[PDB]
Each structure stands twice: as C-alpha cells, then as structure tokens.
Paper text:
We have elucidated the crystal structures of AimR [name] the [name] [name] [name] in its apo form, bound to its DNA operator and in complex with AimP.
To understand how AimR binds to its unusual operator sequence, we determined the crystal structure of [name] AimR bound to a 43-bp DNA fragment, including the AimR operator characterized here. [name] AimR-DNA crystals belong to space group I4122 and diffracted to 2.2 Å resolution. The asymmetric unit contains two AimR molecules arranged as a dimer and an operator-DNA molecule. However, the relative disposition between the TPRN-ter and TPRC-ter subdomains is slightly different [name] that observed in the apo form, and this is reflected in rmsd differences when monomers [name] these structures are compared (rmsd [name] 0.92 to 2.06 Å), confirming the AimR plasticity. As a result of this flexibility, the HTH domain’s disposition changes and the DNA recognition helices α3 increase its separation (1–8 Å) with respect to the apo structures. Similar to other HTH-type DNA binding proteins, the recognition helix α3 [name] the HTH motif inserts into the DNA major groove. Direct readout of the DNA is accomplished via the side chains of residues N30, N32, and Y35, which interact mainly with the T5C6A7/A35G36T37 motif of the [name] AimR box. The K79 and R82 [name] helix α6 in TPR1 as well as N109, N143, and K145 placed in the loops connecting the helices of TPR2 and TPR3 interact with the DNA backbone. These nonspecific interactions are distributed along the two DNA turns generated by the 25-bp spacer and help to maintain an extended conformation and induce some distortion in the DNA. The AimR binding also induces a small bend (around 20°) over the entire operator, with the concave side of the DNA facing the protein and the double G/C pair in the convex kink.
Numbering used by the authors:
A (entry chain A), B (entry chain B): 1 to 386
Write the structure that this text describes.
DNA sequence: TTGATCACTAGATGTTATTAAAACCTAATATTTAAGTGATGGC
DNA sequence: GCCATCACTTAAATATTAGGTTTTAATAACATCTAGTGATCAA
C-alpha cells in the first residue's frame, strides 16, 4: 500500500467530510473513483492531475515523499506511468525519472516504450552524452506514433538550443508544436502548454523583447501549480528587469526565493540571482557565497570587491580565477571584471567579443554600460545589443 | 553506344597515339581498361575520375553534353552511378541528379538505394520542401551503413545551415566529419574534401577571420577541377578582400569571370561582384547593368552616381526605387545610399540596424566603413561585424 | 430523513495479443575491375 | 622492326541472392475508467 493511500485513509478516520472535497479538487463528479483508489491495489486515475491535485491540496509539504513512492509503484505499462514520467521530468525529480525510463524502455507496452525512449534521448542530450545530430537521428529511428511524443521530440530540442545559446532555429521549431493534436493525456498536454509558455518567455528575453517576455512568464504562472515552472518564471521575469529596475527585479527574485527556500537547488538559484542583481547595481551584497569555488560565485566576489574599491581582495580573487578553465561566456565576464579593475577599455572590447561568441545578448550589457559611462557613442553601443 | 565512346573512337581514327595519353590522364598504368571501355557495353572504371578527367582533358567544351549522356545510361546499381550522383550534385546538374535519384531509390542494390535516399533528402532540404528536423529524422530512419553517406548526411545539413544564416552549429558539426573512414569511393572522398574546404572557408568568413577564409578557399582550388567549386572559391576569396584590397579582389573576380563568362548560370555572378567592388572603391564602373530593373542593380546605379556627385541622376534613380517593395536587406542599402547622398550619420545607424535585421554580416561593411572614415571608434565598428 | 461507504453498472477509453507483411542482416556465390602477357597485323 | 589493338589472366574489389531472423502494423480481444445507481449502516 502506497504512502498516499495510507495518509488519505488516516485523514478520513479523523474527518469523514473529505471524500467530496477531494473529488472536486480532483475534477471528479463524484468520489467513487477515490473509494476504489483507497480500497483496491493498482487502481489508477484516468487523469494524473486527479492524484497530483489532491497531494498539493492536502499534503503540499510532503509532495516529493508521497509522489516518489506513488510513481515508483506504478505499473509502467499504463497511461498513469507515462504521466508520471512527465511529472518526474517537469519537477526535475531525476532519480524518479531515470528509474521510470529504464523500466519503460524494456517493457512490452509500445506507448510506454516510445515515451521512455524519447525521454531517454532528452536526458542524454541535456547531459551532453550525445550530440544533437545523434539525438534527432534516434528520434527518426523510433518511428514516433503518439501526438504527445511528437510534441516532446520538438520540446527536447528547444531545451538543447536554449542551453547552448543557439536561438535562431527556436522560433520556427516552437511554431511547429501543435498541442491541440493531443487527445489522450491531458496532464501532459497541460504541462506541455506550460513548457511552451516558459520557452516563449526565454526566446523573447533573448530577442530583448522584454514586455513580451514578461507576458509569456505570466501566462506560464497562470497555467501551472508546479514549483519548477513557477521558479523559472520568476527568475525570467526578474532577469528581464535586472538592468532597468532594481526593485521590481528584487521583488521577483524574493518571491522566487520565498516559494523555494525549502529546496536547496532553488534556494541557491535565487541567492545567485540576488547576488548578481546587487552587484549590477553596486549595492552592499549579503548574498555572496564565500564558500563556493565555482566560477560564477568567485566572479561575484570579485565584482563586489571592485564595486567597493577593495582592489587587492579583487586581485586575489582574479588570481584564483586565472588558474581555471573558462568557457567563452565565463571568459567574457572575466574580461569585464579585469576591465573594471584595471580601468582598461581593451578588456571591455574582449568582453563584448566573448559575449558575442557565446550568443549572449543579456550580460553584454555590463561592458556596454561601462563604455557608455566612459563616453562612447551611445548609438554604436545600442547597435551592439542587436 | 554512349556519345563519349563514339567521340573517343573518332579521335582514335585521326590519331593513334591517344590511348597512352588518355591512360595517364585517367590514372591508369596501361590503357587496357580504355580498350574495354570502347569495345564492351557496360564496362565502367573503378574510379569515376578516370572518365571525368578524360572528358575534361579531351572534350572540355562538351562536358555537360557528354557526361549527361554517359551518366543517364549507367546501370544505377553500380559504384559508377553512385559516383555520377555526386558528380551531378557537385556540378549542380539537377536534371541529371533527380533522374539518378528516382531510379536509385527503387533499385535493388542496397548501397545505391541508400545513396539515392540520402541525396533525395538533400534535394528536398535545399529546396525547402521539408524542414531540417524532418530531414534528420529521415536520415536516422535510413539506418545508414556506408562511410560515404555518413559523411554526406553531415554535409547536407551544413549546406542548410549556411543557406539559412544559422552559423553557430556549423563548427561543431563539420568537426564530426571523418573522410579518412571512406575506403570505397575515392572520387566521392576527394570531392567531399573539396566541399569541406569550401564550407570551412565560409565559416571563417562569417567569423571575420579573413586570412583563414582565404587559406581554405585556396585549398579548395588546389583540390578540384570542378567549375562550381572554382567559381564559389574565387567569389569568396574576392569577397573577403572587397572592403580592404582592391587589386587582389579584382584579380580573383577576373579569374572567376574568365572561367565563367561563357556559362549562363555563373556569368552574372562576377559582373555583379566587379560592379560592387568598383562602387565600394569609387571608381569608374563598366559593370553597371542599366538594363536590369532589379532593386540591387538600381542601387548600384545610384551608388555610382553619388560616388561621382551626379546628384540629379542619383535622385532620379532613388525616385524609381521609392516606388518598389523593399525587403529589410534592400532597406539597409537604401539607408546607406540616403546617408551618403544627404551626408548624415543617422542614416548609417539605420542602415546598420536593417543589415542586422536581415542577418547580413557582409554589406554591413558599407555603412561601417563610412563611420570609420568619419573617425568613429574602430574597435566598436569591428565588434559590429560579429 | 440525512450522509458516508462501497460494489454494482454501461459505455467510452485504454491495453494486450494475434497475425501477416515488411525490413534487416549476413555470408556464399558470383561478377567486374586494373594491369600484366602475348597474339595479330599494318608501317 | 615496333607500335596499336585487344583477348586472356590473376587476385582484389564489388555486386547479388537467398535465408532467416527481427521489426513493424493492424486489429481483434480484453481490461479499466468515470460517474450513475442503489445497499447498508450510523445519526
């Protein structure tokens, strides 16, 4: 017996009004399916949101514990397990996802096998185990039948494009996605709509269409109850304001932090966004992570020191950074910081170069802003953002 | 009997020294395979360069007529037909290519079928009949066996990226290509090496690494006897010099013009390049096409007039142009010309904006060069090329 | 009588098992190639 | 002579075929779901 079923039986003992409340939370017209759920092993809901919405309404702080136990006991050959796979991936519950994938790829239900194989390609691609070319050839070789995996085969590519700064094919590919063709799995259909909204938001951020960016993140927020998408929406909204409005950026990052303070990963993401924000605006910075040796966190240390004319401490931190293997995006920040410290325009030109090499039309604002304050032609600097 | 065989028999009648000359032109140690070629229907050469090199040496002005007749009589189940397919594609002989493809996709030799299907995807992709996504899914579904089609499956993608200005995935993909794995078809192997050189040249041009660009096109030239690659290599070399080195750009364009002035496809290419060159350098310009009413040719007219302070003739030409439907690229030149004529910088900023909207990293050099000559920050202008 | 619990139901959704027909190896068998050899035969 | 022509030839590189898997597609057979119904049992 699954943890969720035991917990629902206990709360029923203490309060016999619950089954009609839970039925409406689950989108059911009467609670007869809930009685069967508690009394009979292996009984699933036709739509996965029935159980997800009860867990979020009744056991919000135990979602992981309960849904992990529930998902990992599911018969992998069912619609419910297919829904669990998307649930796991959307919530970034990767230990759950990878176990589901590994038993779905070997099962004899053809739909579950296809979903499992498609999500495995996504996991392999997002972890740089395979190239984009290899991934899409594998997708073609699968002979995809379901409208669900037809849509996700495009979404997983869009995530790869985003993670590698390859924005130009994104607009055309995202337009091909047709969620209206999905008729079996409404849980997946609705979570994919959320994913589309957040991807559209990130594309607009990249195009520097900042109002549209916010409108898409707001659509994402209205369409979801999933923490991961709420987190990345607030992060995107805040990022879209980072160079123009300290207080509104801060409000979005503090909102994100307040909903995610209990999760170490999301906590640290908002701490890092607040840290970046306070360094951009040259304020005192309580968010600096002196314990990290990652490139990102050391750069913020240096930035804060330079902001306060603590040049030996800044130089110490850059000497530590000189000894590390930077990617192009990392190098661009490195040159921005060296430029601020040494007060040397040449570094800002290299910083801009490396931001252009990493297709970053966002943080490039840092060296552009310095050159603006050094008196360079504003029109040229605006044209460099394009 | 194929036309080439009849022609070779005729020239033998008039001059009985030819078979040993032809054997060495064909890379053969003795001419016994040539005797068999003339005397026995369906006898092919182990390497397709044997026949191609004879045709280019003895019948240079009849290459199309002869090779068309030869290719279209070939048994499509052979190595020779597979070579002919690449020959047709490299030379842009599309009527020949599409007939070969159509009989190869239906034939019962598994290698020819594979080559035929891969080239069909290439033809469909380069004609925008399918998307890149659909193309590579089809490639994966083919289950490619041959090293040749493994390499070409990457090359055909690289061409798509190039034609759509999507340069960022090019460097990573081209590195995966491994020509040393090809052991069967040396004609294909060597033509693909040429193709790699010219793609490398275009990648470097896009990165604004102009010396490297030239080095790759020069390697392409030395590796080929195929007019298409010679043409596009001289065009690229000259284009890489257009804004910086008049005499060298001119020399490359005149070479290109020399080899292509007789040929309807390519003739105009170098006339247009010479026209652009002479307008950039503000010289007398015999290459202006007053007979065209295309937007590009009228813009060149206006440019030449403004270069010589012929302002009423320039205004006449712009009044004609005002009345036409411009795309973004055309608008960018429109603003460049307005800028030169009316002598204000503001127009050069709009010109640059519109070049950036049409992803043109080439003609953008026109307004950048004016701003450079007006004394603006050269580093910023260089950074605008990226 | 309320109301909670639960096993029935029907009809729509989902899942599995059965085929037959395509497709894919692969390894034997057979064919075709380049480049020596030696026969004609016209000078 | 001695040189062009060209059928043999060898062994290496190519092409074909026939077979037995495996893969794929379609659908008939089976099962599970929601949301009504009506039984108990408890006030």
């Amino acid at each position: 017996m699954e943890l969720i079923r035991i917990a629902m039986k206990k709360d029923l003992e203490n309060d016999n009004s619950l089954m009609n409340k839970w039925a409406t939370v689950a989108g059911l017209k009467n609670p007869n399916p809930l009685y069967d759920f508690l009394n009979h092993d292996g009984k699933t809901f036709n739509e996965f949101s029935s159980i997800v919405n009860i867990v979020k309404s009744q056991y919000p702080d135990r979602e992981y514990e309960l849904m992990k136990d529930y998902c990992l006991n599911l018969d992998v050959k069912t619609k419910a397990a297919r829904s669990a796979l998307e649930y796991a991936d959307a919530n970034m519950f990767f230990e759950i996802e990878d176990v589901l994938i590994d038993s779905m790829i070997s099962c004899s239900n053809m739909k579950s096998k296809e979903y499992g194989k498609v999500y495995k390609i996504h996991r392999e691609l997002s972890n740089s185990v395979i190239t984009e070319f290899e991934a899409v050839k594998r997708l073609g070789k699968l002979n995809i039948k379901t409208p669900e995996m037809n849509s996700f085969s495009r979404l997983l590519l869009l995530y790869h494009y985003l993670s590698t700064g390859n924005f130009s094919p994104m607009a055309q590919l995202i337009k091909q996605i047709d969620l209206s063709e999905i008729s079996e799995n409404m849980y997946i259909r609705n979570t994919y709509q959320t994913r589309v909204h957040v991807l559209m938001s990130n594309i607009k951020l990249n195009e520097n269409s900042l109002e549209e960016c916010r409108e898409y993140s707001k659509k994402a927020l209205e369409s979801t109850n999933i923490l991961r998408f709420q987190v990345f929406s607030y992060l995107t909204i805040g990022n879209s304001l980072l160079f123009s409005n300290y207080e509104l950026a801060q409000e979005n990052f503090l909102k994100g932090l307040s909903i995610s303070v209990q999760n170490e990963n999301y906590n640290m993401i908002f701490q890092q966004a607040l840290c970046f924000l306070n360094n951009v605006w040259r304020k005192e910075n309580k968010w600096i992570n002196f314990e990290s040796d990652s490139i990102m966190d050391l750069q913020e240390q240096a930035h804060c020191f330079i902001n306060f004319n603590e040049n030996s401490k800044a130089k110490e931190v850059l000497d530590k950074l000189d000894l590390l293997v930077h990617n192009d995006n990392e190098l661009a920040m490195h040159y921005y910081l060296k430029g601020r410290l040494e007060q040397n325009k040449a570094c800002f030109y290299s910083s801009i170069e490396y931001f252009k090499k990493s297709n970053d039309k966002f943080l490039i604002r840092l060296p552009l802003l310095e050159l603006q304050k050094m008196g360079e032609n504003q029109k040229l600097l605006e044209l460099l953002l394009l």
